[PDB]
Amino acid sequence: TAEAGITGTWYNQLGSTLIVTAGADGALTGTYESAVGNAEGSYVLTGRYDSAPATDGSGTALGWTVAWKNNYRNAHSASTWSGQYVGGAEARINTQVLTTSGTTEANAWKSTLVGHDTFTKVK
């Protein structure tokens, strides 16, 4: 199931660690530790996934958010990852990521980064 496949620890191409629990009805909850940027220690993660995905070979749509504030740091920023889980022996979460920083209205045009993150079950 996607519930069983998503739940656990994932690692990205930059050295970051996702620890997530997928709930039976579509909740994603957990923590994120980024290896880059204005971040240190773990941050709360919340999101949603399709808890009844297609059975035709398609991936399982999901997304989550992290606000970059914890006890050690506040980067006045939040990232959202949007993507799909692909199961099996070489399981992946393939994502596109938006990172928005709080800005003045004048600087809003440079508020949001776009990137892409690929997560695997092994480091």
Contact 6, 49 (CB under 8 A): yes
Token pair in block for residue 27: 């909740």
The Cα 3–Cα 13 span in angstroms is 23
Locate the DSSP E strands across the chain: 8-11, 17-22, 27-33, 43-49, 60-69, 74-86, 92-101, 112-120
Resolution of the coordinates, Å: 1.6
Q: Which CATH class is domain 1-123?
A: mainly beta
| Placement of tokens 């889980």 in the chain | 85
Token duo for residue 18: 């996702």
DSSP class of 104: -
> In the chain, where are the structural domains located?
1-123
**Sequence-distant (≥ 6) Cβ neighbours of residue 80 within 8 angstroms:** 63, 64, 65, 97, 98
Residue 86 neighbours by CB distance under 10 Å: 15
Q: Do 50 and 61 touch, CB atoms closer than 8 A?
A: yes
Experimental method: X-ray
Q: Is 43 exposed, middle or buried (CB count within 10 Å of its CB: 0-12, 13-18, 19+)?
A: buried
